[PDB]
Structure 1
Amino acid sequence: MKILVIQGPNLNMLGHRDPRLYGMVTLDQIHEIMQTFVKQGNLDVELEFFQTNFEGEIIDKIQESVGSDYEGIIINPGAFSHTSIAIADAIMLAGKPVIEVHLTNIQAREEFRKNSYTGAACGGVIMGFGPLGYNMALMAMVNILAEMKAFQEAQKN
């Protein structure tokens, strides 16, 4: 399975600013960690990574996964989680599993971060585990996809 990993605004600045809620691990490092979770679990999973500060590039990227070779999306829309009805609408039209990840616990910060329009549109949401949350999402995605295919095996029969 090809799994698309989408990283929203300012996530490329990880490990260069703000080790209060963020630590000192970089975005590339998290992606390396995801890669070795796949490698070593021996999962038939090809990860593709995409980071952007543009809401429209996120929407473009989600729309291009439709009818593509991608079976699922792992997304951290960053600040756009709280504001982007348009990303939420793209998610609802994706026709495939989408898991939202947050590094931080968005229930425990400013009032303006508590709402997630994107999260409400995703099947599941993970927050507050830092980098590990992405490994959690990979484990879930693999199980969701296995379960979906095995359901559609015994489906026709």
Structure 2
Amino acid sequence: MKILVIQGPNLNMLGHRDPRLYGMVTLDQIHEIMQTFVKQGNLDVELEFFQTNFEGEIIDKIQESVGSDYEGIIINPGAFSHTSIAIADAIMLAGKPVIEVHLTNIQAREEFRKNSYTGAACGGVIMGFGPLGYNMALMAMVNILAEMKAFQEAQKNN
């Protein structure tokens, strides 16, 4: 149960960014909290982490998810959320749960960040919880999978 955690542009440079918005925490620091959340909870989730500043590297990674290894995706497309129809379209073709996270509340920054093409394509969106939103994402994905697959056995047996 590989979850793929895709992180978009400039997220690797957290802790060189405005700390009023982003606190004083790094991308690596986030990803540990995420394992520490898993390791603790005792979810048989394997997390994989992939950061990139390129739109097409995101689309490729989503597309590569289409084969069996991954059961879901937690993605923060970053600033691309607001422009990238392409990443949205990739999210629409994945055949697996995608949950959108933002550290900041994108309802309360510049007007250009309000709309998320990508988040509209995902099942659900979380925003403004800082690093914590990623664990709430994990919570959700684990829950959703358990529902979907509890549901598949309950129709191949009828």
RMSD of aligned C-alpha atoms? 0.6
Structure 1 residue 16, shift from structure 2 partner? 2.3
How many residues are treated as equivalent by the alignment?
A: 157
Structure 1 counterpart of 2:111? 111
Q: Distance in 2 between matches of 1:115 and 1:16?
A: 25
Structure 2 unaligned residues grouped into runs of 5+: none
Structure 1 residue 17, shift from structure 2 partner? 2.5
Write out per-residue CA displacement over residues 57-105 of structure 1, whole angstroms, 9 at most, x where no aligned residue: 0000000000231000000000000000000000000010000000000
TM-score normalised to the size of structure 1? 0.98
Write out per-residue CA displacement over residues 22-65 of structure 1, whole angstroms, 9 at most, x where no aligned residue: 01110000000000100010001000000000000000000000
Identity of aligned residues (%): 100
Deviant stretches of 4+, over 6 Å: none
SS of residue matched to 1:21: helix
Structure 1 unaligned residues grouped into runs of 5+: none
Structure 1 counterpart of 2:123? 123
Q: Distance in 1 between matches of 2:112 and 2:16?
A: 24
Equivalent positions of 1:34-113 (< 5 A) are 34-113=34-113
Moved more, 97-106 or 62-71: 62-71
TM-score normalised to the size of structure 2? 0.98
